[PDB]
RNA sequence: GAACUCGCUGUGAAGAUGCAGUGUACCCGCGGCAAGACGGAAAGACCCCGUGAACCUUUACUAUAGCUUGACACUGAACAU
């Protein structure tokens, strides 16, 4: 999944930027707590 | 099935009231007995057959519920080997 990130997740990676992450992991914690937004642009 | 429904000996799907020979016997009831009518009942239960059925068994065949194994999915992060 690729996900424009809100934030400094100190894991991997920085503000505003489309990055792939594991499906589960931005389901569940990125976007239910800010931190990334899917890439549909 | 219909009967004007005797005994014997034989013959005969091979154990005869009914065929042959022969003996006996007037016609019809009533009370009894139960030897025969292969008496009545039940399309033999025993036996065999049917490429018949059912239930039952098992290390008969084929499956399958269940139990169980791993892959993938829901399912992600960090780190160390
Ligand atoms: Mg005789
Ligand atoms: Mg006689
Ligand atoms: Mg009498
Ligand atoms: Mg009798
Ligand atoms: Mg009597
Ligand atoms: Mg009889
Ligand atoms: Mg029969």
Redesign the pocket.
């Given at each position: 999944m690729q996900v424009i990130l809100l934030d400094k997740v100190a894991?991997?990676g920085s503000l505003g930027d489309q990055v792939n992450?594991?499906?589960?992991?931005a389901?569940?914690?990125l976007v239910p707590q800010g931190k990334a937004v899917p890439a549909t642009k």
């Open positions: 894991n991997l992450v594991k499906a589960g992991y389901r569940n914690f």
